Amino acid sequence: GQKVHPNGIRLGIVKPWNSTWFANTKEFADNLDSDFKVRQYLTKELAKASVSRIVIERPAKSIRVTIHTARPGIVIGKKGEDVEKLRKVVADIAGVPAQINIAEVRKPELDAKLVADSITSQLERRVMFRRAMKRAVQNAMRLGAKGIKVEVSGRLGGAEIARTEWYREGRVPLHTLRADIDYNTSEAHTTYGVIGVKVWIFKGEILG
Amino acid sequence: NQYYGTGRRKSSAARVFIKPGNGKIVINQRSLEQYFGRETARMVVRQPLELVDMVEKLDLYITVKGGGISGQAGAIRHGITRALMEYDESLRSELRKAGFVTRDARQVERKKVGLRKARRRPQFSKR
Amino acid sequence: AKQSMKAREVKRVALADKYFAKRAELKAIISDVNASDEDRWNAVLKLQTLPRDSSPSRQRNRCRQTGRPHGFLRKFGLSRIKVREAAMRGEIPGLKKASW
Amino acid sequence: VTEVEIDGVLHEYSTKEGVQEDILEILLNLKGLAVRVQGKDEVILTLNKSGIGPVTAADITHDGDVEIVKPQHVICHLTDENASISMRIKVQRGRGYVPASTRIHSEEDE
Amino acid sequence: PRSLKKGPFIDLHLLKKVEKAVESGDKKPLRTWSRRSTIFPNMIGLTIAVHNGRQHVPVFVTDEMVGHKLGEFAPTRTYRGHA
Amino acid sequence: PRRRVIGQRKILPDPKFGSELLAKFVNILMVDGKKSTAESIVYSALETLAQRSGKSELEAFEVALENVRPTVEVKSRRVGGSTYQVPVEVRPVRRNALAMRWIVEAARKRGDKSMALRLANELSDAAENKGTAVKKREDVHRMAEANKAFA
Amino acid sequence: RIRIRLKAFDHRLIDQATAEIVETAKRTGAQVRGPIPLPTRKERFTVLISPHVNKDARDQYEIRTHLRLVDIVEPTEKTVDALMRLDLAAGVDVQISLG
RNA sequence: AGAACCUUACCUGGUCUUGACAUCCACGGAAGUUUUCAGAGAUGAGAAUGUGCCUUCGGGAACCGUGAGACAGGUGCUGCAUGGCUGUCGUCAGCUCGUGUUGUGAAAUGUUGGGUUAAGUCCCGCAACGAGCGCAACCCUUAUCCUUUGUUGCCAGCGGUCCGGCCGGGAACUCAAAGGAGACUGCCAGUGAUAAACUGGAGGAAGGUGGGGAUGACGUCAAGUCAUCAUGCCCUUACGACCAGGGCUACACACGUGCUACAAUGGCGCAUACAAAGAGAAGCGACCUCGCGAGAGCAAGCGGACCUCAUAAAGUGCGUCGUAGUCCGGAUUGGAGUCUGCAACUCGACUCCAUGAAGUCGGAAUCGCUAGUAAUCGUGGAUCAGAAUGCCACGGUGAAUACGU
């Protein structure tokens, strides 16, 4: 289990946190649990909507969710009909006043998580994994990624002996802390088993 | 008029003040002989003064916190040296030669997961 | 862990919540040196009568996601494994890898 | 005033429950507002009010460093006592005239 | 051992049974699982078949057994020898 | 080591006499990083020794050391089938150390009661040219002599 | 006097908050004491990173809780109330205490 | 990162079967609240209260009850079907690719060669020219300085004193964070191929990657984990669920890792000095009183630079013991008890009084460590009702040695 998590190593420097609140040792665990719940719910709901990052932020006994999604239109539905619906359920989950914001993700080919999800979907609907991977890589490159890597693993083409294959393009420096490396993962629950998809997308280096 | 130098060594932090006088040393409102029971400590605090003949010339008020005894002594010495540097500024070379201007940056190495200590690895066996 | 175990834990917790006032009182009575012997005895017997799951020393801290009894942390309410994952994802606020 | 956020709204050409001015009238009366912040350069106010009667500018739940210098600036005319309105205004600071068309793609913060 | 202030321990049900036996004046063995129960003066004379995990083993109580518990006279493990 | 020779670390002279050698000796004596006790012991040894032989504290010690320093030690090359012990001229820094170590060992061995006393006795023996350290030195020399053919 | 205890995980954020608070104070009232930095709590955690077994395999995390002590010497009419509407940025637990 | 119960997955009995855990209807009842006897308990039988959000009244959503099935459930098997996560060679300096060229081709070249470096590090050459992942740097920490801000932290100079920074105060110093500066072979000399570098010295707190951490290339071991989790045959009145008791703590024996010893560089007694880093609300618990003591009682201060844990110990001084199986050593066992806990029999920790094994430095062999390291001394934390000699942290004292390959 060689490698360090690329997001996790960079949280202090170039990457920010998702859950962004303060709490004392008393209420912290509970808060975490709540976050887990709400996030889980959101994932369940907005599966068909291309959702990248849920950012929870709770000040003053009131939860502020921020959903980063590629297509707001399907998450919002009719203007303030679906979002509103989501909100009350979120509140219920939390046990506090809820507030949902929806950030529009520019360039969903450069968002790593989204790409991973897409790949997983493709796998599920029985495409050639390799071709999917290629598409993922190519598209990102076209869009202006300084580099991208993707990796898929296990029961590829329903083969008895599992293996991993991966496509890199451009440069993807992981040891370099100041590199904006959007990393994320997904899992294709195929007929032969799970197929795990990792993808690293290098936006560029930050100078500060 | 009183001159000053900060002392630091291990986790000790001495506050040495130099004044002109007869040569009486006070460390936390106690004499040098009272505070440092150890001879070595005493020697180390007197070293810089010995090196530059100003033992009888100047009194020094000290307060030190943190660390043990030897470390504390070292810190005090450092402080004294600093004070001297501040005060004369022509004794620097001698001090350098001695090796007192140098802050001894040796801190205790942290314990590391896996190991029992900073470097002691646990007992190995092939079988 | 199993579902069943989790359920049991929940039940225990519920019991604890229920019977706290009484149990505590009983304990106090038992302790109180300035009290009758017979009364003390009664208290001791009374305690026995109450359900076992009512005790707080019965309930085990499990992970809030997986129910894993071991490797638990109190601040997060999660087992080590899950905690790490959370940290990696950015889901625990303030938590990052520490070096010194 | 730069961005106005009313709850239970779809677009600015709709209408709302319990009010007089329509939403374009509310946006015009908010465009006439006169605010004076001191410390920050971008603040978010809050206006919450229910009950029959006009909604002055003096009903905004002010923070410490914002000063609303027109306590008779009318915005809404709430007629139903079961009606409510909860808008969240955003006040930037600049110069000149920057309009909605140019600020339709200029805005970077998604 | 248990604190002196807390008193001796005996299971309530067991105690009740003992009392009943005393009242009767019968000497039929009382099968019991309370190995943790202390023996009492009134229990002297009674046979009380204590569980050892597997089976109930008869224990005729004596004057010497009083301070002790019932589980002391009902060994659980069954080791004969290694050869 | 393979890569790089390194400069020997700085050693402070002892507070009583102002000597590097003495300090080194004290360090050698020391156990469990209890320097102070060891130094006290050393001092005690010196004082008794001084009383015994006259002279000074330091001078006497030096003299004692001199009688246990080895001119030549041996090392195992073993190039052949069987091992050949080869003599080598032991350098100034090392020789001094070795003698001290031997003395310490002797002291440790010795059947007298207090450590300091034992040390003093050892020193005296060294001065006179009898005892354990001296014997060891002789043995070392003897071995070298035996294997003088190798050079 | 109003003592104010700012607590947060992000240091920059905390700093920002503190400045804001000072600003709020200084316009209305007079003689703000100052933003005094107290010691940071570095609550560390070790965990085994393997799913099953490998004990020397470990990750050592920490949460750096920063403290900022801001004090206000003269509470006026205008000043104290100003904080009511003036909420601070999220992820910064404030704790005002008069006297 | 903590088995008395619980945990628990195992055994023995006692029990349940759409079920402990969910969703779905049907229709019986508001949920729930209190209490009673039998039972080891699980469970199996009683007495009191309530009818809230809405009805062209065939009724509803929360929460119990019963029956049907659809299903639940499985710490059951396969890590040789998998994902994820982990170890490992190894923080070893390597592993590749594109285009070109060489070869019928597998392939080669680059990546070799002269030097150099911790480094496929850098230069020079050269059928290679370029690129990527890694060897470096960016990140944390530690060593010096400066600016800012000074309470709960500090006391240099001032006045007062209960001689306590405690109180006027002061913002110096320590310290506390936040932001900057600083180290780059940059400067000097020599060696070197007109080089990359190396050797020394100057300054400097720091010198050649300053010390330490994080960071683990392509891959290897069908390495580990289906019992964290997820996931592609088997059980479903039982390989599921509830309960009480027992077991996981057994004991001819063998091995691993530790602690404590065998003593005088020490043991014991009395006095006495100098830390760091942490934790704390079902929590840490001063002072005072009682107890030989573990503790008990009373009970402030404190979500904490404030109060509490909390006396650091080794050390230092004075006394004693005088090489003994001892005033070394503490196992073992008896008595009596303290606390936690429904509950300390199996099987907790700690205390007191007694008891006082083996052991006098350990065979063959075998491990760690290059500096604030080893060695030794205490201190804290996590899990945790209670239960560490383990683990993870912190400072104290503080060595030896490196000729060389």
PDB file of C-alpha atoms in Angstrom, chain F:
ATOM      1  CA  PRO F   1      32.912   3.911   7.954  1.00  0.00           C
ATOM      2  CA  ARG F   2      33.259   3.710   4.154  1.00  0.00           C
ATOM      3  CA  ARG F   3      32.487   7.160   2.854  1.00  0.00           C
ATOM      4  CA  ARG F   4      33.937   9.895   5.057  1.00  0.00           C
ATOM      5  CA  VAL F   5      36.311  10.310   7.981  1.00  0.00           C
ATOM      6  CA  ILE F   6      34.931  12.781  10.560  1.00  0.00           C
ATOM      7  CA  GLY F   7      36.533  15.178  13.055  1.00  0.00           C
ATOM      8  CA  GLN F   8      36.512  13.982  16.685  1.00  0.00           C
ATOM      9  CA  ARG F   9      33.974  15.848  18.858  1.00  0.00           C
ATOM     10  CA  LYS F  10      34.910  18.546  21.379  1.00  0.00           C
ATOM     11  CA  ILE F  11      35.592  17.445  24.975  1.00  0.00           C
ATOM     12  CA  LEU F  12      35.583  19.849  27.950  1.00  0.00           C
ATOM     13  CA  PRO F  13      38.399  19.649  30.530  1.00  0.00           C
ATOM     14  CA  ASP F  14      37.417  18.664  34.092  1.00  0.00           C
ATOM     15  CA  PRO F  15      36.648  21.504  36.576  1.00  0.00           C
ATOM     16  CA  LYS F  16      39.100  20.446  39.324  1.00  0.00           C
ATOM     17  CA  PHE F  17      42.436  20.208  37.455  1.00  0.00           C
ATOM     18  CA  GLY F  18      41.589  21.557  33.972  1.00  0.00           C
ATOM     19  CA  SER F  19      42.625  18.465  32.011  1.00  0.00           C
ATOM     20  CA  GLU F  20      41.247  16.834  28.853  1.00  0.00           C
ATOM     21  CA  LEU F  21      42.757  13.427  29.589  1.00  0.00           C
ATOM     22  CA  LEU F  22      41.231  13.409  33.065  1.00  0.00           C
ATOM     23  CA  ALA F  23      37.830  14.290  31.619  1.00  0.00           C
ATOM     24  CA  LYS F  24      38.143  11.472  29.096  1.00  0.00           C
ATOM     25  CA  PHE F  25      39.032   9.035  31.870  1.00  0.00           C
ATOM     26  CA  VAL F  26      36.014  10.157  33.887  1.00  0.00           C
ATOM     27  CA  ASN F  27      33.772   9.667  30.855  1.00  0.00           C
ATOM     28  CA  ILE F  28      35.171   6.173  30.341  1.00  0.00           C
ATOM     29  CA  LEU F  29      34.523   5.347  33.987  1.00  0.00           C
ATOM     30  CA  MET F  30      30.928   6.670  33.811  1.00  0.00           C
ATOM     31  CA  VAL F  31      27.900   4.411  33.445  1.00  0.00           C
ATOM     32  CA  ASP F  32      24.229   5.158  32.585  1.00  0.00           C
ATOM     33  CA  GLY F  33      25.130   8.816  31.883  1.00  0.00           C
ATOM     34  CA  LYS F  34      25.764   9.411  35.604  1.00  0.00           C
ATOM     35  CA  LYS F  35      28.779  11.578  34.977  1.00  0.00           C
ATOM     36  CA  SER F  36      28.872  13.459  38.270  1.00  0.00           C
ATOM     37  CA  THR F  37      29.121  10.394  40.493  1.00  0.00           C
ATOM     38  CA  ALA F  38      31.821   8.974  38.229  1.00  0.00           C
ATOM     39  CA  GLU F  39      33.772  12.225  38.361  1.00  0.00           C
ATOM     40  CA  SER F  40      33.511  12.273  42.159  1.00  0.00           C
ATOM     41  CA  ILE F  41      34.835   8.716  42.252  1.00  0.00           C
ATOM     42  CA  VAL F  42      37.718   9.686  39.983  1.00  0.00           C
ATOM     43  CA  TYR F  43      38.554  12.630  42.221  1.00  0.00           C
ATOM     44  CA  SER F  44      38.529  10.374  45.274  1.00  0.00           C
ATOM     45  CA  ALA F  45      40.852   7.931  43.524  1.00  0.00           C
ATOM     46  CA  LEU F  46      43.213  10.762  42.628  1.00  0.00           C
ATOM     47  CA  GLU F  47      43.283  12.142  46.159  1.00  0.00           C
ATOM     48  CA  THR F  48      44.089   8.805  47.781  1.00  0.00           C
ATOM     49  CA  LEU F  49      46.655   8.097  45.072  1.00  0.00           C
ATOM     50  CA  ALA F  50      48.225  11.516  45.631  1.00  0.00           C
ATOM     51  CA  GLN F  51      48.436  10.832  49.358  1.00  0.00           C
ATOM     52  CA  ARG F  52      50.075   7.475  48.693  1.00  0.00           C
ATOM     53  CA  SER F  53      52.697   8.377  46.077  1.00  0.00           C
ATOM     54  CA  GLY F  54      53.168  12.094  46.856  1.00  0.00           C
ATOM     55  CA  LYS F  55      53.788  14.150  43.692  1.00  0.00           C
ATOM     56  CA  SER F  56      50.576  15.824  42.420  1.00  0.00           C
ATOM     57  CA  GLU F  57      47.134  14.316  41.725  1.00  0.00           C
ATOM     58  CA  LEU F  58      47.455  14.675  37.960  1.00  0.00           C
ATOM     59  CA  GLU F  59      51.143  13.849  37.611  1.00  0.00           C
ATOM     60  CA  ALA F  60      50.788  10.593  39.532  1.00  0.00           C
ATOM     61  CA  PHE F  61      47.830   9.598  37.364  1.00  0.00           C
ATOM     62  CA  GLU F  62      49.832  10.346  34.226  1.00  0.00           C
ATOM     63  CA  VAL F  63      52.710   8.224  35.509  1.00  0.00           C
ATOM     64  CA  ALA F  64      50.323   5.363  36.232  1.00  0.00           C
ATOM     65  CA  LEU F  65      48.883   5.626  32.728  1.00  0.00           C
ATOM     66  CA  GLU F  66      52.374   5.546  31.244  1.00  0.00           C
ATOM     67  CA  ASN F  67      53.085   2.117  32.728  1.00  0.00           C
ATOM     68  CA  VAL F  68      49.931   0.625  31.038  1.00  0.00           C
ATOM     69  CA  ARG F  69      50.125   2.251  27.537  1.00  0.00           C
ATOM     70  CA  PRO F  70      50.738  -0.274  24.700  1.00  0.00           C
ATOM     71  CA  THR F  71      53.395   0.517  22.050  1.00  0.00           C
ATOM     72  CA  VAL F  72      51.962  -2.172  19.747  1.00  0.00           C
ATOM     73  CA  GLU F  73      48.638  -4.037  19.517  1.00  0.00           C
ATOM     74  CA  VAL F  74      47.490  -6.815  17.155  1.00  0.00           C
ATOM     75  CA  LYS F  75      44.653  -7.248  14.637  1.00  0.00           C
ATOM     76  CA  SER F  76      43.227 -10.238  12.718  1.00  0.00           C
ATOM     77  CA  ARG F  77      43.862 -10.168   8.937  1.00  0.00           C
ATOM     78  CA  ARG F  78      43.184 -13.899   8.296  1.00  0.00           C
ATOM     79  CA  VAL F  79      44.035 -13.822   4.522  1.00  0.00           C
ATOM     80  CA  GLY F  80      45.090 -17.507   4.641  1.00  0.00           C
ATOM     81  CA  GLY F  81      43.095 -20.600   5.604  1.00  0.00           C
ATOM     82  CA  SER F  82      43.938 -20.139   9.283  1.00  0.00           C
ATOM     83  CA  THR F  83      43.938 -16.732  11.009  1.00  0.00           C
ATOM     84  CA  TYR F  84      47.139 -14.651  11.314  1.00  0.00           C
ATOM     85  CA  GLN F  85      47.241 -12.026  14.084  1.00  0.00           C
ATOM     86  CA  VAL F  86      49.266  -9.069  12.740  1.00  0.00           C
ATOM     87  CA  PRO F  87      50.992  -6.411  14.908  1.00  0.00           C
ATOM     88  CA  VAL F  88      50.300  -2.735  14.224  1.00  0.00           C
ATOM     89  CA  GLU F  89      51.768   0.453  15.708  1.00  0.00           C
ATOM     90  CA  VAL F  90      48.957   1.916  17.837  1.00  0.00           C
ATOM     91  CA  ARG F  91      48.481   5.683  17.436  1.00  0.00           C
ATOM     92  CA  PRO F  92      48.824   8.395  20.189  1.00  0.00           C
ATOM     93  CA  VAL F  93      45.106   9.097  20.508  1.00  0.00           C
ATOM     94  CA  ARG F  94      44.201   5.417  20.742  1.00  0.00           C
ATOM     95  CA  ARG F  95      46.955   4.201  23.057  1.00  0.00           C
ATOM     96  CA  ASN F  96      45.979   6.635  25.802  1.00  0.00           C
ATOM     97  CA  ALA F  97      42.352   5.547  25.524  1.00  0.00           C
ATOM     98  CA  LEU F  98      43.224   1.857  25.659  1.00  0.00           C
ATOM     99  CA  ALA F  99      45.277   2.154  28.834  1.00  0.00           C
ATOM    100  CA  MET F 100      42.473   4.053  30.549  1.00  0.00           C
ATOM    101  CA  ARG F 101      39.935   1.439  29.494  1.00  0.00           C
ATOM    102  CA  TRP F 102      42.137  -1.370  30.795  1.00  0.00           C
ATOM    103  CA  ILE F 103      42.566   0.434  34.104  1.00  0.00           C
ATOM    104  CA  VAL F 104      38.814   0.846  34.409  1.00  0.00           C
ATOM    105  CA  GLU F 105      38.301  -2.846  33.674  1.00  0.00           C
ATOM    106  CA  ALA F 106      40.849  -3.752  36.342  1.00  0.00           C
ATOM    107  CA  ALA F 107      39.082  -1.506  38.842  1.00  0.00           C
ATOM    108  CA  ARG F 108      35.757  -3.140  38.020  1.00  0.00           C
ATOM    109  CA  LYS F 109      37.287  -6.585  38.516  1.00  0.00           C
ATOM    110  CA  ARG F 110      39.039  -5.771  41.801  1.00  0.00           C
ATOM    111  CA  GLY F 111      37.899  -7.285  45.125  1.00  0.00           C
ATOM    112  CA  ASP F 112      38.122  -4.100  47.248  1.00  0.00           C
ATOM    113  CA  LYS F 113      34.915  -2.484  48.510  1.00  0.00           C
ATOM    114  CA  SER F 114      34.406   1.093  47.204  1.00  0.00           C
ATOM    115  CA  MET F 115      34.842   1.798  43.470  1.00  0.00           C
ATOM    116  CA  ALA F 116      37.033   4.844  44.050  1.00  0.00           C
ATOM    117  CA  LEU F 117      39.302   2.930  46.416  1.00  0.00           C
ATOM    118  CA  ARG F 118      39.648   0.122  43.887  1.00  0.00           C
ATOM    119  CA  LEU F 119      40.543   2.627  41.178  1.00  0.00           C
ATOM    120  CA  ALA F 120      43.167   4.196  43.433  1.00  0.00           C
ATOM    121  CA  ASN F 121      44.650   0.773  44.145  1.00  0.00           C
ATOM    122  CA  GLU F 122      44.794   0.011  40.431  1.00  0.00           C
ATOM    123  CA  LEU F 123      46.545   3.323  39.785  1.00  0.00           C
ATOM    124  CA  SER F 124      49.075   2.562  42.510  1.00  0.00           C
ATOM    125  CA  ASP F 125      49.732  -0.861  40.999  1.00  0.00           C
ATOM    126  CA  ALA F 126      50.256   0.711  37.582  1.00  0.00           C
ATOM    127  CA  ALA F 127      52.705   3.201  39.071  1.00  0.00           C
ATOM    128  CA  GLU F 128      54.637   0.361  40.749  1.00  0.00           C
ATOM    129  CA  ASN F 129      54.365  -1.899  37.620  1.00  0.00           C
ATOM    130  CA  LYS F 130      52.262  -4.774  39.026  1.00  0.00           C
ATOM    131  CA  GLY F 131      48.471  -5.435  38.840  1.00  0.00           C
ATOM    132  CA  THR F 132      45.872  -6.265  36.179  1.00  0.00           C
ATOM    133  CA  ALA F 133      46.104  -3.489  33.598  1.00  0.00           C
ATOM    134  CA  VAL F 134      49.880  -3.880  33.440  1.00  0.00           C
ATOM    135  CA  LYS F 135      49.494  -7.637  32.984  1.00  0.00           C
ATOM    136  CA  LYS F 136      47.029  -7.071  30.152  1.00  0.00           C
ATOM    137  CA  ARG F 137      49.440  -4.650  28.495  1.00  0.00           C
ATOM    138  CA  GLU F 138      52.248  -7.194  28.786  1.00  0.00           C
ATOM    139  CA  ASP F 139      50.047  -9.862  27.231  1.00  0.00           C
ATOM    140  CA  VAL F 140      49.198  -7.533  24.357  1.00  0.00           C
ATOM    141  CA  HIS F 141      52.883  -6.804  23.810  1.00  0.00           C
ATOM    142  CA  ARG F 142      53.767 -10.483  24.119  1.00  0.00           C
ATOM    143  CA  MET F 143      51.281 -11.453  21.421  1.00  0.00           C
ATOM    144  CA  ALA F 144      52.703  -8.792  19.111  1.00  0.00           C
ATOM    145  CA  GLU F 145      56.222 -10.064  19.755  1.00  0.00           C
ATOM    146  CA  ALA F 146      55.124 -13.607  18.957  1.00  0.00           C
ATOM    147  CA  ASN F 147      53.578 -12.453  15.667  1.00  0.00           C
ATOM    148  CA  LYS F 148      56.434 -10.038  14.769  1.00  0.00           C
ATOM    149  CA  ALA F 149      57.172 -12.154  11.653  1.00  0.00           C
ATOM    150  CA  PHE F 150      54.058 -10.580  10.079  1.00  0.00           C
ATOM    151  CA  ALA F 151      54.500  -6.922   9.037  1.00  0.00           C
TER     152      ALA F 151
END
